Amino acid sequence: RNKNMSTIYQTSATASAGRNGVVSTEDKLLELNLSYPKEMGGSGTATNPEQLFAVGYAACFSNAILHVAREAKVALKEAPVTATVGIGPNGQGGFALSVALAAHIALEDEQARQLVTVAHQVCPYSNAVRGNIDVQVSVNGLAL
Amino acid sequence: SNAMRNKNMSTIYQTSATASAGRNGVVSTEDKLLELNLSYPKEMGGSGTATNPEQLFAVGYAACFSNAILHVAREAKVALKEAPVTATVGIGPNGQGGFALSVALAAHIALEDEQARQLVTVAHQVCPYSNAVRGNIDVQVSVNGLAL
Numbered sequence: 001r002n003k004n005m006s007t008i009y010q011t012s013a014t015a016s017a018g019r020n021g022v023v024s025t026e027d028k029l030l031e032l033n034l035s036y037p038k039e040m041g042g043s044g045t046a047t048n049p050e051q052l053f054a055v056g057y058a059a060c061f062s063n064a065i066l067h068v069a070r071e072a073k074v075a076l077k078e079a080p081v082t083a084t085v086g087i088g089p090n091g092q093g094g095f096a097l098s099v100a101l102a103a104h105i106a107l108e109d110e111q112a113r114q115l116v117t118v119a120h121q122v123c124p125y126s127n128a129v130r131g132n133i134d135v136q137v138s139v140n141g142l143a144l
Numbered sequence: 145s146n147a148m149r150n151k152n153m154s155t156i157y158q159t160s161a162t163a164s165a166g167r168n169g170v171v172s173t174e175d176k177l178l179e180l181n182l183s184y185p186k187e188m189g190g191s192g193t194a195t196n197p198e199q200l201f202a203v204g205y206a207a208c209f210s211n212a213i214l215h216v217a218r219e220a221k222v223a224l225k226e227a228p229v230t231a232t233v234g235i236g237p238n239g240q241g242g243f244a245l246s247v248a249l250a251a252h253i254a255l256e257d258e259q260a261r262q263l264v265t266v267a268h269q270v271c272p273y274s275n276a277v278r279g280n281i282d283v284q285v286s287v288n289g290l291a292l
């Protein structure tokens with residue numbers, strides 16, 4: 001489930017001032033300023049690793065749903081996904097993420113459900129956090 | 145996996161983003177601090193002209209891990225001006241019909257030997273990304289070119 005058996009795509013990024021400086025892909029396709037959010041005492045003038053994870057997870061899960069749709073020959077124009085990410089202490093000295101994913105799919109409900117369930121199985125963010133984060137997944141307003 | 149080490153016991157910060165992905169996708173945070181175009185990479189049947197979830201994961205994990213190192217150096221009163229971290233992320237098939245990420249974290253800091261190992265080991269226990277992927281991804285962590 002967890003082994004990447006043959007790398008199809010590889011990328012890299014470098015940061016040096018943690019949550020409060022610049023971060024960029026080594027190809028420079030993506031170059032971003034980061035700052036602490038207001039909730040953490042910062043300026044909120046820029047993004048942060050929690051928002052990045054939300055953006056990337058929403059995008060990965062949306063890609064995943066469209067992937068499965070293509071494979072099932074289901075014509076889906078869009079697969080909007082809202083990802084909500086929280087961060088707090090884990091009580092052992094570190095920090096942990098909590099995640100909710102809300103998918104909105106123009107299909108009959110049982111069908112949408114099946115599709116999104118398979119997508120959650122195949123999505124590499126989902127495989128990455130499986131058993132660590134209990135990702136709360138819903139499809140068209142209903143929890144899976 | 146370890147569920148327990150991943151209980152968010154009380155939320156300090158919460159954020160939301162909505163993506164409509166694909167070949168011409170878009171994602172934006174609820175508050176628009178971040179609005180991005182998405183594409184599949186050229187390696188994956190796309191145009192590779194905008195970003196993608198692996199790049200976003202790499203930028204996020206690199207920043208998170210750099211911060212984790214500075215955080216532990218601060219607590220330990222070890223003077224670091226900075227903590228360069230390169231995060232390398234790959235995606236490929238898993239053999240069960242899905243996809244998996246592979247990740248390396250390469251730190252380059254002004255501290256060595258067992259002290260640096262101890263410090264970066266601590267940073268890797270506390271970083272939320274590392275706790276999210278523990279046991280699933282075997283994150284290859286190195287400091288100053290050497291295995292953690």
Ligand SMILES: C[C@@H](CS)C(=O)N1CCC[C@@H]1C(=O)O
Binds near residue numbers: 063
């Ligand atoms: C660039 C990646 C998004 S992480 C992708 O296009 N896909 C579609 C196939 C693998 C993966 C997925 O989400 O399941």
